[PDB]
UniProtKB/Swiss-Prot annotation, chain A:
It comes from Saccharomyces cerevisiae (strain ATCC 204508 / S288c). It is found in: Vacuole membrane. The modification Phosphoserine is found at residue 129. This is V-type proton ATPase subunit B. ATP binds at residue 364. The lineage of its organism: Eukaryota, Fungi, Dikarya, Ascomycota, Saccharomycotina. GO terms for biological process: ATP metabolic process; endosomal lumen acidification; Golgi lumen acidification; intracellular calcium ion homeostasis; pexophagy; proteasome storage granule assembly; proton transmembrane transport; transmembrane transport. NCBIfam families: PRK04196.1 (NF003235), V-ATPase_V1_B (TIGR01040). V-ATPase is a heteromultimeric enzyme composed of a peripheral catalytic V1 complex (components A to H) attached to an integral membrane V0 proton pore complex (components: a, c, c', c'', d, e, f and VOA1). Interacts with RAV1 and RAV2 components of the RAVE complex, which are essential for the stability and assembly of V-ATPase. There is a cross-link at residue 6 (Glycyl lysine isopeptide (Lys-Gly) (interchain with G-Cter in ubiquitin)). GO terms for molecular function: ATP binding; proton-transporting ATPase activity, rotational mechanism. Present with 131000 molecules/cell in log phase SD medium.
UniProtKB/Swiss-Prot annotation, chain C:
The lineage of its organism: Eukaryota, Fungi, Dikarya, Ascomycota, Saccharomycotina. Changing residue 86 to G: In VMA4-1; is rapidly degraded at 37 degrees Celsius. The chain holds residues 60 to 232 of 233 of the full protein. This is V-type proton ATPase subunit E. Signal peptide: none annotated. Its main location: membrane. GO terms for molecular function: proton-transporting ATPase activity, rotational mechanism. Keywords: Acetylation, Coiled coil, Hydrogen ion transport, Ion transport, Membrane, Transport, Vacuole. It is a peripheral membrane protein. The gene is VMA4. Belongs to the V-ATPase E subunit family. Homodimer. V-ATPase is a heteromultimeric enzyme composed of a peripheral catalytic V1 complex (components A to H) attached to an integral membrane V0 proton pore complex (components: a, c, c', c'', d, e, f and VOA1). Interacts with VMA5; the interaction is direct. Interacts with VMA10; the interaction is direct. Interacts with RAV1 and RAV2 components of the RAVE complex, which are essential for the stability and assembly of V-ATPase.
């Protein structure tokens, strides 16, 4: 009590704030003040247009006695004779509390569910601070998503940051909904969700809301919605609010958060948008040079820590512009994150759901995840053999389509049959068809038995002797 | 005396009333004394790059000076610990703050100032003459490093007037006094040095001793000499972490300085809690590796500027250890991040760019940095010898090999280990593109090879030509098929696949497939070449290879499984096993072919 | 199969309804809490208005408020606007204002003070002052109601910790 | 199907009253605690707002 109280006794510290009236410049999304007294870098101001409306913004540069304020909600209609700028005197901060669960917030974090203002427990700077590596522990426990394609060859550990690449016009939303609906552990249900969507159409938002309604999980989650109609500059704020709330919950309440961002492509687009507004050096494809650092800042809030039992997990959703991995967005995202799950077109064109391929997918934490106390030793070797045979089947199919069926050795036809059966039965599963690791692996064993035992190379003899016979 | 802030823009700060400031002089700014580095000077004002977060700074904040450049404190205790980019211990910060974040403006000594060391005097006595770089006593540091030599800092010379006796001291004690023209000299167990100035050295030399890495392909086709440089491009999926970790673990270096410039960060915790139980037998036995390393960690999340000084600190520490005569081997993690930081700083400063937005001096900076590596003879009386061998790992943006940073590096380095993406996707984990990757220390190493393994050089070229011919026949067979293929071509393709599946695959998790000594790989590739040669001889003598291969049978399986032999069994028992396998294979080809 | 789909969607509808009921109950509870807190704030306004009707106590309070406004403003000249009851004592104790200014703003004593012919909506305010520089472009709204409203955004954590006990779930403050 | 719909059709009021009664004690407890600790908070707020604090920007 007293320990907590001493941390809050400084609240009763009323401090008047001065509001200037010397707006002396404007262009694009930037506003320029003059004769400001002792500026303060990266603070918050509240404008007041002549009609009484008030917009927010933060200073980005401080010359000698003049601050280049940046406005969020556009700049049209700003007067030079009547506007009145006001200074909060402190950086951007938001209230937080465990009561935010079950509430819906707009892009700026104010409630939009007809409820009252959050009865805050304290305020926190949105940007946060880094975590010293010495106080970090990588995870060693496996989550069971029920999706065989994931829970078999690309496992997920509590603490990982696995993005889900995707292309416009694919059911990534349904995959995310299924994952959140089947987020159980291998083995309570403390998996709070802080879904935070930016720049999305109305139907996606309503679909997500209904999906959360049906599973009786809305009372265990919070929503940060920012549709397309909202201002672009404000877009870059929402993920930071979401991550701040997630880390607060996971490191000051010992919860097990599960955050699922979406459409990081729109966030990068907003970065480009209000980056070319200024004249900073462009990177590749006109993107800012420091997008790598910014994305690192966004992503590098993950994993478990020394003292707190809480955890955290990120599943951001990407939207490749023209189905190219070499695009800068996926490039940097892969450079940062720890493996990712991929989605193809043809598989979707082939009516296969979930249309997940595995050849380009990767997950680093598999090594620590799999083992004995959680799964059978075979786990890793089974996956490796599946990779090898799948690749061989793919190349054999290509070559056969090229030349014909005459040069396809018996092994080639076996590989073609294996590839067909795999892509037709192993991956396909229903919208509500769960698959625990045990039964999924047992089914997977069925597909390999088509091969004669001896050819299997990447699998140790013990596994073949003790499992292939059955 | 003091200066006031005049303008701020993210990481760049411009002060005023700064007259006595020099260029590159270290400065402390803000009410929390954030560290900076003056860059450009214009009258009263002088641009500063800040090495920490700049949020909430206000115009009018006082600015201080130090009058000395950036420097790192050497001496005992450096090793077995973890430091940030600007030489701040990390465990001490967490313990003192009892937090999980890094409190901005926190200050701690570089080296622990409380513990005491069992010092022993050297061989010099009062009245003797000494010059910079001469040892004057050893210090016990660890069971793995019994002798931690202490040195007289360069550019300091004279005749010793008083020395301390054997005993236990803290590194604050003044254990030596040097009498130059005046008696203004005192020396404790430690000193400092400006990072941007490479440490002096008596003279360089030519490296002619291989840097064993434990990897089959690396040691066989692209050897790395103990004293050279390398480069490891990638495409964020090639899994280059595996080879970095393997060489940091099982290499034969006396010390290693892992440095992380813009890393995922979690790997730092991985190495932190993974190393403490992995023993080495270089000296005595059972000594855990963590008593053989120093980590300079700087995650990509932490401020941009520190990514600059991190690598300088790492290389300076490596040079210091080399000066003791121990063949240290530093290894970087991502050079591209350094170039990105430099580009960002240049662009924010508002200066004309160069190729792909980068500045113009990046090539010169990279060349100067790489030049510090190389074997040499220490500077001092004992005449000890050391060596450094840096191993960078570039990371292009699009995954190709045409970005400016990679092109600049390839003009400097002399060993190239390219990493393909598709091979990694196929789980052929040591995925190295054997088509473009090349080495340059091949010829010089013959002096070692003839003494140790005369036949190795001809055999490596044998395999190289075999692989080249297989790659030349693959496209023709793909575009036509096996219809127009002779028996010899099919033999070549089969042996090429056998090599790609056996001699090129590895996994650092199986006990036997974690470290391959030189002799094991030598014998294995010897056996491979002998098998192919016998097959070619038989088919030339006349036999249907389609018929011959089925009869040959089990010998192919035996050579494929040869790698399963437990390494370090006897070092000669395995030699006898290889001899017996070769003999039985030759007999089989003598009879089975018949 | 269609009947199975129909019973599935019926179950979906009833589950949605019960979830909505739970959400509405939680919102009602939170709204009640907020209404009680606002009611608590309400009393302070009338208490301050009552306090603002006693000259003996009011005078030092007003003097201190104007002094704080000037100290933060740091200008040689100033303009203050309110009901002009105390121009005499103010501009005469403005000697004391200059004295305390040089005591704290030791750079120099204040040059002058000017009282505007404008006033405030005293039905909307209960005293206080508004201070602006000579050029009348930099203002510090520092009335009693404004101060109370401003404080009503920073005491929320302290107010919570006082009214209720510490959040039993919180483990690290 | 119609019988199934009617089964939970009439239960809407049942659940309404169930939840309503479920949250009544907390509702009155909030009022009671608000009454208990009201005056002191008002006194603290008045003391804080009325109390000035001489200051000047430190960098000046």
């Amino acid at each position: 009590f007293a320990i907590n109280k001493k941390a809050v006794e400084q609240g009763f510290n009323v401090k008047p704030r001065l509001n200037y009236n010397t707006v002396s410049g404007v262009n694009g999304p930037l506003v320029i003040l003059e004769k400001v007294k002792f500026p303060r870098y990266n603070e918050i101001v509240n404008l007041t247009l002549p009609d009484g409306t008030v917009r927010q913004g933060q200073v980005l540069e401080i010359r000698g006695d003049r601050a280049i304020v940046q406005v969020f909600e556009g700049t049209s209609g700003i007067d030079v004779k009547k506007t009145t700028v006001e200074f909060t005197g402190e950086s951007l901060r938001i209230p937080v509390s465990e009561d935010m669960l079950g509430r819906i917030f707009d892009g700026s974090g104010r409630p939009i569910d007809n409820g009252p203002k959050v009865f805050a427990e304290d305020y926190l700077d949105i940007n946060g601070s880094p975590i010293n590596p010495y106080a970090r522990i990588y995870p060693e426990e496996m989550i069971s998503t029920g999706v065989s394609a994931i829970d078999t060859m690309n496992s997920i550990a509590r603490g990982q940051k696995i993005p889900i690449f995707s292309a416009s016009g694919l059911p990534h939303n349904e995959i995310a909904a299924q994952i959140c609906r089947q987020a159980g552990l291998v083995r309570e249900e403390n998996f709070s969700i802080v879904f935070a969507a930016m720049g999305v159409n109305l139907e996606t938002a309503r679909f997500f809301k209904q999906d959360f309604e049906e599973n009786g999980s809305l009372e265990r989650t919070s929503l940060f919605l920012n549709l397309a109609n909202d201002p672009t500059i404000e877009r870059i704020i929402t993920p930071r609010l979401a991550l701040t709330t997630a880390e607060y919950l996971a490191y000051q309440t010992e919860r097990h958060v599960l955050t699922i961002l979406t459409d990081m492509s729109s966030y990068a687009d907003a970065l480009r948008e209000v980056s070319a507004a200024r004249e900073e050096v462009p990177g590749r494809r006109g993107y800012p040079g420091y997008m790598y650092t910014d994305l690192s800042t966004i992503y590098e809030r993950a994993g478990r820590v020394e003292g707190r039992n809480g955890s955290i997990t990120q599943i951001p959703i990407l939207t490749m512009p023209n189905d190219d991995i070499t695009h800068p967005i996926p490039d940097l995202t892969g450079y940062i994150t720890e493996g990712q799950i991929f989605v193809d077109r043809q598989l979707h064109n082939k009516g296969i759901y979930p249309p997940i391929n595995v050849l380009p997918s990767l997950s680093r934490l598999m090594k620590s995840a799999i083992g004995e106390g959680m799964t059978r030793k075979d786990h890793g070797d089974v996956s490796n053999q599946l990779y090898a045979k799948y690749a061989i089947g793919k190349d054999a199919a290509a070559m056969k389509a090229v030349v014909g069926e005459e040069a396809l050795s018996i092994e080639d036809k076996l590989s073609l049959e294996f590839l067909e059966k795999f892509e037709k039965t192993f991956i396909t599963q229903g919208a509500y068809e769960d698959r625990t690791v045990f039964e999924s692996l047992d089914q997977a064993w069925s597909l390999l038995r088509i091969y004669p035992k001896e050819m299997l190379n990447r699998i140790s003899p013990k596994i073949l002797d003790e499992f292939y016979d059955r | 005396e003091y200066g006031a802030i005049y303008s701020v823009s993210g990481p760049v700060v411009i002060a005023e009333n700064m007259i006595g400031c020099a260029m590159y002089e270290l400065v402390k700014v803000g009410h929390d004394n954030l560290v900076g580095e003056v860059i450009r000077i214009d009258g009263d004002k002088a641009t500063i790059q800040v090495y920490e977060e700049t949020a909430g700074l206000t115009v009018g904040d006082p600015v201080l000076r130090t009058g000395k450049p950036l420097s790192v404190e050497l001496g005992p205790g450096l090793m077995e610990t973890i430091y940030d980019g600007i030489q701040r211990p990390l465990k001490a910060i967490k313990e003192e703050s009892q937090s999980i974040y890094i409190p901005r403006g926190i200050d701690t000594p570089a080296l622990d100032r409380t513990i005491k060391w069992q010092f022993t005097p050297g061989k010099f006595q009062v009245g003797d003459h000494i010059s910079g770089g001469d040892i004057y006593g050893s210090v016990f540091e660890n069971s793995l490093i019994s002798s931690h030599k202490i040195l007289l800092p360069p550019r300091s010379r004279g005749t010793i007037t008083w020395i301390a006796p054997a005993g236990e001291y803290t590194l604050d004690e003044k254990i030596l006094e040097v009498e130059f023209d005046g008696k203004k000299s005192d020396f404790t167990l430690y000193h400092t040095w400006p990072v941007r100035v490479p440490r002096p050295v008596t003279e360089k030399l030519s490296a002619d001793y291989p840097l064993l890495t434990g990897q089959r392909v690396l040691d066989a086709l692209f050897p790395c000499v103990q004293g050279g440089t390398t480069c490891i491009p990638g495409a964020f999926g090639c899994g280059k972490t595996v080879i970095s970790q393997s060489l940091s673990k099982y290499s034969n270096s006396d010390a290693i300085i892992y440095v992380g410039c813009g890393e995922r960060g979690n790997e730092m915790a991985e190495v932190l809690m993974e190393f403490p139980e992995l023993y080495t037998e270089m000296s005595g036995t059972k000594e855990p590796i963590m008593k053989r390393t120093t980590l300079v960690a700087n995650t990509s999340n932490m401020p941009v500027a520190a990514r600059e000084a991190s690598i300088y600190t790492g290389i300076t520490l490596a040079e210091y250890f080399r000066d003791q005569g121990k063949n240290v081997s530093m290894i970087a993690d991502s050079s591209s991040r350094w170039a990105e930081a430099l580009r960002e700083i240049s662009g924010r400063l508002g200066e004309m760019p160069a190729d792909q937005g980068f500045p113009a001096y990046l090539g010169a900076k990279l060349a100067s940095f790489y030049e510090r590596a190389g074997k040499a003879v220490a500077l001092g009386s004992p005449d000890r010898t050391g060596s450094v061998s840096i191993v960078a790992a570039v990371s292009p943006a699009g995954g190709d090999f045409s970005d400016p940073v990679t092109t600049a590096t390839l003009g400097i380095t002399q060993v190239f280990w390219g990493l393909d993406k598709k091979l990694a996707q196929r789980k052929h984990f040591p995925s190295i593109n054997t088509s473009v990757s090349y080495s340059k220390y091949t010829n010089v190493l013959n002096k070692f090879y003839d003494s140790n393994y005369p036949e190795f050089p001809v055999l490596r070229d044998r395999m190289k030509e075999i692989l080249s011919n297989a790659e030349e026949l693959e496209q023709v067979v793909q575009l036509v098929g096996k219809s127009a293929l002779s028996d010899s071509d099919k033999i070549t393709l089969d042996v090429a696949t056998l090599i790609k599946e056996d001699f090129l695959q590895q996994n650092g998790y199986s006990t036997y497939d974690a470290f391959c000594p030189i002799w094991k790989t030598f014998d294995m590739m010897r056996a491979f070449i002998s098998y192919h040669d016998e097959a070619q001889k038989a088919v030339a003598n006349g036999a249907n290879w389609s018929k011959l291969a089925d009869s040959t049978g089990d010998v192919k399986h035996a050579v494929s499984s040869s790698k399963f032999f437990e390494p370090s069994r006897g070092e000669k028992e395995v030699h006898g096993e290889f001899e017996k396998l070769l003999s039985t294979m030759q007999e089989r080809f003598a009879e089975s072919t018949d | 199969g269609n009947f199975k789909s129909k019973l599935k969607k019926a179950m979906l509808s009833q589950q949605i309804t019960k979830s909505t009921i739970a959400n509405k109950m939680r919102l009602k509870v939170l709204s009640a809490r907020e209404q009680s807190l606002d009611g608590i704030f309400e009393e302070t306004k009338e208490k301050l208005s009552g306090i603002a009707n006693n000259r003996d106590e009011y005078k030092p309070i007003l003097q201190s408020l104007i002094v704080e406004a000037l100290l933060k403003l740091l200008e040689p000249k100033a303009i203050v606007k309110a009901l002009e009851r105390d121009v005499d004592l103010i501009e005469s104790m403005k000697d004391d204002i200059m004295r305390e200014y040089g005591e704290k703003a030791q750079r120099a004593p204040l040059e002058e003070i000017v009282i505007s012919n404008d006033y405030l909506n005293k039905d909307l305010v209960s005293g206080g002052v508004v201070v602006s520089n000579a050029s009348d472009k930099i203002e510090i709204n520092n009335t009693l109601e404004e101060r109370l409203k401003l404080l009503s955004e920073e005491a929320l954590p302290a107010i919570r910790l006082e009214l209720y006990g510490p959040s039993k779930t919180r483990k690290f403050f | 199907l119609k019988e199934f719909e009617q089964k939970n059709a009439g239960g809407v009021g049942e659940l309404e009253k169930k939840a309503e009664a479920g949250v009544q004690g907390e509702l009155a407890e909030i009022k009671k605690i608000a009454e208990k600790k009201k005056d002191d908070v008002v006194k603290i707020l008045i003391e804080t707002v009325i109390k000035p604090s001489a200051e000047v920007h430190i960098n000046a």
